Amino acid sequence: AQNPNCNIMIFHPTKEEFNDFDKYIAYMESQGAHRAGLAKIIPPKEWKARETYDNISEILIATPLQQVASGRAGVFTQYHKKKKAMTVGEYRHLANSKKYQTPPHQNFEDLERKYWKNRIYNSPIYGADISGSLFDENTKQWNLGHLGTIQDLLEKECGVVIEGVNTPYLYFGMWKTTFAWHTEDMDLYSINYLHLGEPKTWYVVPPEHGQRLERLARELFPGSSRGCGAFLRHKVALISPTVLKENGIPFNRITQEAGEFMVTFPYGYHAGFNHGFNCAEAINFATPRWIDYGKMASQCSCGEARVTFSMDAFVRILQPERYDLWKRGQD
């Protein structure tokens, strides 16, 4: 068995190996990368996502989200308070202000320590989940707006044609902006490219151990657990590495820097935070190996998780028993 300790693997494809996206994902899995839940891909030195980022300031963040925490430093939830629209230029200036900027620090470990110590005492503003792309149309390799769609993968593997579309999303971050512990919708893959700015630290639980994280989360968030049998689908709960270690939960961590891709694998729980002003682009995707994960994915039917148009068809075809109840949640 490849990668039996489930370590995060880092790949350095050549420009020739960067041509065929599907084939490279399958290669990484042949080496055991999926066992970690997360892999890093450093693009060949010849590649670029676009020529410059000098002209992005007028992108609108229609609904910036202020991430307000509750709980204790290592075990907390966050809720998202909607703020007034602002441009990316306005948001960058806000991120760099004395109230929101990254503190002085020695290295990524010191910054990580400071994040876990102090996150709950601040409410950073995240420009998350913005439909769009920063890849140049002429970038032919690993262009997250030109990937094969999940609906086409389902149709190729299973023969059924379904409605829905699959487009990327932009994330503009600042110091302390946080992504809560989650797997993807329908336990899909995700791919995330850090276009510019300061790093993003990731934490990940191996897919084979995901239920250990779920059992800890039920213990730590006991009212949420009674409310919903899949409350991590709400994407609000945070648990620190110190707490995970105290409870014996297997996990790994890695920091992504600008110019790097991360891939999350089916049922790989992940969480993390931004170091300072940055912009990432991410999208879900599927492979043949995903189909069985999609059939088994948990679902929120309490109504809180409220998700995309395209997830309807995935539930309807892969999980027809659940369909009915899940759709009562979504209506």
Q: Which residues bind ligand OGA (CB under 6 A)?
A: 171, 179, 190, 192, 264, 270, 280, 282
- Least separation in angstroms between residue 123's CB and ligand OGA is 16
Is 234 annotated for ligand binding? yes
Q: Is 182 annotated as a binding residue?
A: yes
Instruction: Specify the stretch interacting with Mg ion by CB under 5 A; choose among 50-58, 140-148, 173-181, 189-197.
Output: 50-58
Among 58, 99, 121, 248, binds Mg ion (CB under 5 A): 58
The answer to whether 228 is a known ligand-binding residue is yes
**Pairwise CA distance, residues 254 & 221, whole Å:** 26
Closest to 311 (Cα-Cα) out of 292, 325, 326, 324: 326
16 binding partner (options Zn ion, Mg ion, Ni ion, none; Cβ < 5 to 8 Å by kind): none
**Binding-site partner at residue 171 among Ni ion, Zn ion, ligand OGA, none, CB < 5 to 8 Å by type:** ligand OGA
The Cα–Cα gap between 86 and 37 comes to 34
Of the pair 151, 264, the CB lying nearest ligand OGA is at: 264
User: Annotated binding residue at 235?
Assistant: yes
**DSSP strand pairing (261-264 vs 38-41):** antiparallel
Instruction: State the Cα torsion 196-199-205-207 to the nearest 10°.
Output: 20
- Helix, strand and coil content of the chain, in percent to the nearest 5, comes to 30, 25, 45
Q: Which residue has the tokens 């999926």?
A: 34
Please identify, among the stretches 54-62, 111-119, 166-174, 183-191, the one whose residues bind Mg ion according to the rule CB under 5 A.
Answer: 54-62
Question: Rounded to an integer, what distance in angstroms lies between the CA atom of residue 162 and that of residue 176?
Answer: 39
Q: Which is nearer to ligand OGA, 74 or 173 (CB)?
A: 173
Find the shortest distance in angstroms from Cβ 192 to Ni ion: 7
279 annotated ligand-binding residue: no
Phi and psi at 237, nearest 5°, equal -105, 135
Q: Note the residues at the interface with Mg ion (CB under 5 A).
A: 56, 58-59
